Amino acid sequence: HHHHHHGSELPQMVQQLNSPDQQELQSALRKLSQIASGGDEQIQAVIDAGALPALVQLLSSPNEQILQEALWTLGNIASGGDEQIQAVIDAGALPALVQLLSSPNEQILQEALWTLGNIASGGDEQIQAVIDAGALPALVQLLSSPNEQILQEALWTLGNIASGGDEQIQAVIDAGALPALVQLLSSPNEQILQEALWTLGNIASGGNEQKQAVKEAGALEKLEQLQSHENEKIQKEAQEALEKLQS
Ligand SMILES: [Ca+2]
Ligand SMILES: [Ca+2]
Ligand SMILES: [Ca+2]
Ligand SMILES: [Ca+2]
Ligand SMILES: [Ca+2]
Ligand SMILES: [Ca+2]
Ligand SMILES: [Ca+2]
Ligand SMILES: [Ca+2]
């Protein structure tokens, strides 16, 4: 598409996020999400127009049509630079995001997990905020989910968190992730095995204390077994995870 210089148009769209006309509101929210899907430059224009605090208030809305679009906007902003991610944090998104991990609406749940995952793909500061906001217990609980679509998104977000510093990995371990991940390594669903290996791999690349807890949990047995799985992608992923574990 096309270069557009957003004038005063962008702060004006932001104002309509507090309009009592939901059709104006939705229109603005749609345009913002489309903007936010561009690069870091487009994202920055949305931040600089003051969109973050208006978006965050919409995360309390009982209107799922508004909420889904606001989440999508925030997830996209969080796909930017670490400071763009921090902006989202600084605007108070995380408490609402964590409380949305309890939604019975799977579409909302997934969007919230996705957004969280994006924020957690940031630097150690951004990951720490996710941890401090109490995301881990819900995340570990979702590893027991029978909804494979939700499971994959929870595994990805955990994986991102476990891409942080050793104490951040330890945080994941202290929340109980290892037993759930080890159980997942016996799934007869190879898609799940791959997703679990990615996450477990990340954990296994922490320091000695994290590497040891990985062994205490029973992962080596499973990893060694999976070295010879029929599926050559799984073989490669179990090999990568085992190699990471042993550095
Ligand atoms: Ca109205
Ligand atoms: Ca720029
Ligand atoms: Ca509703
Ligand atoms: Ca439902
Ligand atoms: Ca990153
Ligand atoms: Ca299912
Ligand atoms: Ca400790
Ligand atoms: Ca199978």
PDB file of all heavy atoms in Angstrom, residues 172-187:
ATOM      1  N   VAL A 172       9.288 -19.143  35.711  1.00  0.00           N
ATOM      2  CA  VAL A 172       8.424 -20.064  34.947  1.00  0.00           C
ATOM      3  C   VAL A 172       8.454 -21.442  35.579  1.00  0.00           C
ATOM      4  O   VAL A 172       7.429 -22.144  35.671  1.00  0.00           O
ATOM      5  CB  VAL A 172       8.897 -20.153  33.475  1.00  0.00           C
ATOM      6  CG1 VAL A 172       8.131 -21.229  32.722  1.00  0.00           C
ATOM      7  CG2 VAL A 172       8.751 -18.792  32.793  1.00  0.00           C
ATOM      8  N   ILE A 173       9.647 -21.813  36.007  1.00  0.00           N
ATOM      9  CA  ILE A 173       9.820 -23.053  36.682  1.00  0.00           C
ATOM     10  C   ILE A 173       9.075 -23.012  38.043  1.00  0.00           C
ATOM     11  O   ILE A 173       8.353 -23.932  38.370  1.00  0.00           O
ATOM     12  CB  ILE A 173      11.319 -23.349  36.894  1.00  0.00           C
ATOM     13  CG1 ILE A 173      12.017 -23.492  35.524  1.00  0.00           C
ATOM     14  CG2 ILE A 173      11.507 -24.597  37.779  1.00  0.00           C
ATOM     15  CD1 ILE A 173      13.526 -23.541  35.601  1.00  0.00           C
ATOM     16  N   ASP A 174       9.210 -21.929  38.795  1.00  0.00           N
ATOM     17  CA  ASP A 174       8.585 -21.881  40.124  1.00  0.00           C
ATOM     18  C   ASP A 174       7.039 -21.933  40.023  1.00  0.00           C
ATOM     19  O   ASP A 174       6.343 -22.461  40.918  1.00  0.00           O
ATOM     20  CB  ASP A 174       9.084 -20.647  40.915  1.00  0.00           C
ATOM     21  CG  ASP A 174      10.638 -20.672  41.234  1.00  0.00           C
ATOM     22  OD1 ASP A 174      11.305 -21.721  41.093  1.00  0.00           O
ATOM     23  OD2 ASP A 174      11.200 -19.601  41.608  1.00  0.00           O
ATOM     24  N   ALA A 175       6.483 -21.418  38.917  1.00  0.00           N
ATOM     25  CA  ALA A 175       5.068 -21.520  38.634  1.00  0.00           C
ATOM     26  C   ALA A 175       4.556 -22.911  38.259  1.00  0.00           C
ATOM     27  O   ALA A 175       3.335 -23.109  38.158  1.00  0.00           O
ATOM     28  CB  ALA A 175       4.705 -20.556  37.510  1.00  0.00           C
ATOM     29  N   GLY A 176       5.438 -23.893  38.058  1.00  0.00           N
ATOM     30  CA  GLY A 176       4.959 -25.262  37.799  1.00  0.00           C
ATOM     31  C   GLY A 176       4.912 -25.703  36.334  1.00  0.00           C
ATOM     32  O   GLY A 176       4.248 -26.670  35.988  1.00  0.00           O
ATOM     33  N   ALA A 177       5.651 -25.028  35.471  1.00  0.00           N
ATOM     34  CA  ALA A 177       5.529 -25.313  34.020  1.00  0.00           C
ATOM     35  C   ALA A 177       6.142 -26.676  33.693  1.00  0.00           C
ATOM     36  O   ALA A 177       5.685 -27.352  32.781  1.00  0.00           O
ATOM     37  CB  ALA A 177       6.244 -24.254  33.199  1.00  0.00           C
ATOM     38  N   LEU A 178       7.148 -27.097  34.466  1.00  0.00           N
ATOM     39  CA  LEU A 178       7.941 -28.222  33.976  1.00  0.00           C
ATOM     40  C   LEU A 178       7.152 -29.488  33.962  1.00  0.00           C
ATOM     41  O   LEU A 178       7.197 -30.202  32.976  1.00  0.00           O
ATOM     42  CB  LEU A 178       9.267 -28.369  34.681  1.00  0.00           C
ATOM     43  CG  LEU A 178      10.297 -27.316  34.358  1.00  0.00           C
ATOM     44  CD1 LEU A 178      11.551 -27.562  35.196  1.00  0.00           C
ATOM     45  CD2 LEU A 178      10.640 -27.288  32.875  1.00  0.00           C
ATOM     46  N   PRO A 179       6.444 -29.803  35.047  1.00  0.00           N
ATOM     47  CA  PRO A 179       5.651 -31.028  34.965  1.00  0.00           C
ATOM     48  C   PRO A 179       4.664 -31.063  33.816  1.00  0.00           C
ATOM     49  O   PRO A 179       4.441 -32.126  33.245  1.00  0.00           O
ATOM     50  CB  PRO A 179       4.918 -31.060  36.304  1.00  0.00           C
ATOM     51  CG  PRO A 179       5.860 -30.412  37.220  1.00  0.00           C
ATOM     52  CD  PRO A 179       6.514 -29.308  36.435  1.00  0.00           C
ATOM     53  N   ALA A 180       4.037 -29.924  33.513  1.00  0.00           N
ATOM     54  CA  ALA A 180       3.041 -29.878  32.452  1.00  0.00           C
ATOM     55  C   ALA A 180       3.721 -30.088  31.114  1.00  0.00           C
ATOM     56  O   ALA A 180       3.219 -30.838  30.308  1.00  0.00           O
ATOM     57  CB  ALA A 180       2.297 -28.549  32.456  1.00  0.00           C
ATOM     58  N   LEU A 181       4.882 -29.468  30.928  1.00  0.00           N
ATOM     59  CA  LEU A 181       5.616 -29.611  29.676  1.00  0.00           C
ATOM     60  C   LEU A 181       6.094 -31.038  29.485  1.00  0.00           C
ATOM     61  O   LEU A 181       5.953 -31.584  28.415  1.00  0.00           O
ATOM     62  CB  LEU A 181       6.801 -28.687  29.603  1.00  0.00           C
ATOM     63  CG  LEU A 181       6.475 -27.283  29.262  1.00  0.00           C
ATOM     64  CD1 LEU A 181       7.725 -26.488  29.519  1.00  0.00           C
ATOM     65  CD2 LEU A 181       5.922 -27.114  27.831  1.00  0.00           C
ATOM     66  N   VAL A 182       6.558 -31.671  30.553  1.00  0.00           N
ATOM     67  CA  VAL A 182       7.007 -33.038  30.452  1.00  0.00           C
ATOM     68  C   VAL A 182       5.859 -33.974  30.087  1.00  0.00           C
ATOM     69  O   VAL A 182       6.040 -34.879  29.247  1.00  0.00           O
ATOM     70  CB  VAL A 182       7.711 -33.475  31.764  1.00  0.00           C
ATOM     71  CG1 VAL A 182       8.027 -34.953  31.750  1.00  0.00           C
ATOM     72  CG2 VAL A 182       8.997 -32.700  31.918  1.00  0.00           C
ATOM     73  N   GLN A 183       4.680 -33.757  30.673  1.00  0.00           N
ATOM     74  CA  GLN A 183       3.495 -34.541  30.321  1.00  0.00           C
ATOM     75  C   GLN A 183       3.184 -34.293  28.850  1.00  0.00           C
ATOM     76  O   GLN A 183       2.753 -35.192  28.107  1.00  0.00           O
ATOM     77  CB  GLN A 183       2.302 -34.150  31.194  1.00  0.00           C
ATOM     78  CG  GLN A 183       1.040 -34.998  31.019  1.00  0.00           C
ATOM     79  CD  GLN A 183      -0.254 -34.249  31.309  1.00  0.00           C
ATOM     80  OE1 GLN A 183      -0.797 -34.345  32.428  1.00  0.00           O
ATOM     81  NE2 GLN A 183      -0.771 -33.468  30.287  1.00  0.00           N
ATOM     82  N   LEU A 184       3.383 -33.064  28.406  1.00  0.00           N
ATOM     83  CA  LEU A 184       3.045 -32.822  27.005  1.00  0.00           C
ATOM     84  C   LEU A 184       3.970 -33.569  26.058  1.00  0.00           C
ATOM     85  O   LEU A 184       3.578 -33.811  24.915  1.00  0.00           O
ATOM     86  CB  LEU A 184       3.052 -31.324  26.683  1.00  0.00           C
ATOM     87  CG  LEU A 184       1.911 -30.557  27.368  1.00  0.00           C
ATOM     88  CD1 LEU A 184       2.144 -29.076  27.121  1.00  0.00           C
ATOM     89  CD2 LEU A 184       0.544 -30.935  26.872  1.00  0.00           C
ATOM     90  N   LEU A 185       5.189 -33.889  26.507  1.00  0.00           N
ATOM     91  CA  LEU A 185       6.112 -34.646  25.649  1.00  0.00           C
ATOM     92  C   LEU A 185       5.719 -36.082  25.340  1.00  0.00           C
ATOM     93  O   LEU A 185       6.311 -36.691  24.437  1.00  0.00           O
ATOM     94  CB  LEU A 185       7.537 -34.585  26.160  1.00  0.00           C
ATOM     95  CG  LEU A 185       8.204 -33.219  26.143  1.00  0.00           C
ATOM     96  CD1 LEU A 185       9.640 -33.385  26.592  1.00  0.00           C
ATOM     97  CD2 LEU A 185       8.158 -32.523  24.790  1.00  0.00           C
ATOM     98  N   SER A 186       4.700 -36.594  26.024  1.00  0.00           N
ATOM     99  CA  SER A 186       4.067 -37.853  25.691  1.00  0.00           C
ATOM    100  C   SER A 186       2.762 -37.711  24.873  1.00  0.00           C
ATOM    101  O   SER A 186       2.006 -38.669  24.707  1.00  0.00           O
ATOM    102  CB  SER A 186       3.723 -38.572  26.993  1.00  0.00           C
ATOM    103  OG  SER A 186       4.907 -38.932  27.651  1.00  0.00           O
ATOM    104  N   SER A 187       2.460 -36.535  24.345  1.00  0.00           N
ATOM    105  CA  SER A 187       1.214 -36.398  23.607  1.00  0.00           C
ATOM    106  C   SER A 187       1.348 -37.189  22.336  1.00  0.00           C
ATOM    107  O   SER A 187       2.419 -37.180  21.747  1.00  0.00           O
ATOM    108  CB  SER A 187       0.967 -34.941  23.238  1.00  0.00           C
ATOM    109  OG  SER A 187      -0.212 -34.894  22.472  1.00  0.00           O
TER     110      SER A 187
END
